[PDB]
Amino acid sequence: YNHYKRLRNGDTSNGVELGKSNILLIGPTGSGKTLLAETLARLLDVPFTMADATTLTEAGYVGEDVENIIQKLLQKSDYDVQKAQRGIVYIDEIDKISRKSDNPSITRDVSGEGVQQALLKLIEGTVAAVPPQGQQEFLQVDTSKILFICGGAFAGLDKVI
């Protein structure tokens, strides 16, 4: 509901920029986190897509890149940057990129901490260079008005709390 108001107010017909707020769905495994995302796409009037955090990796590695998430969004928006800059995204398995008891950072956690570092500018908002289809053009998509939902199981977080 708030996202639609921001989209309808995309012309900034006020004295503020109507910043966005991202959600973090922390639920026990098997509670329906993924279901809540699929069901939400049946009544959404804006492009929506799903992604997995286990496949994501830091830039410059064989693993998947964070910018690939926006690539899927363009397909749902008919490769329209205007429509893609106001869509929704639901990241999954966000609890797997958490540091694996390696706070000292002996080695760079490309599959862990490295993914979080690359996503910092994505959630807040940054002009990302997405491939033309899937490097000659590197289409520029602004993620400042794109909502990012993160869903994970966080197995063991109960002990910390």
């Binding site: 639920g27 026990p28 098997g30 509670s31 329906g32």
Partner: protein
């Protein structure tokens, strides 16, 4: 919040795409109308909770309990209804085939 026996029972019928409704449509293609008793669903939740499978376990439990039921219906006509009872889940009993 974690799903409980009561939640599983509701999820078995309340959702528009519930597991029970999905099987009902599957049997509707053949012509027979499938019905799930309240007690049957209650036992289903207890089995899933014991196995720790949760909601996903519901599909496995029903598949095994209805495997033989749907193994003859395609080639075994004259049936009109197939009532499911709690005992059917345990395997002691068998589907109460009805003819009409």
């Amino acid at each position: 919040n974690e799903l409980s026996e009561e939640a599983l029972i509701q999820i078995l019928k309340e959702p528009k795409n519930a597991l029970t409704k999905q099987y009902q449509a599957l049997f509707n293609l053949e012509g027979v109308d499938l019905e799930f008793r309240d007690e049957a669903l209650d036992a289903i939740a207890k089995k899933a909770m014991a196995r720790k499978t949760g909601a996903r376990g519901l599909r496995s439990i029903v598949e095994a309990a209805l495997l033989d039921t749907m193994y003859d219906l395609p080639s075994m006509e004259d049936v009109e209804k197939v009532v499911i009872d709690e005992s059917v889940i345990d395997g002691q009993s068998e589907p109460l085939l009805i003819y009409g």
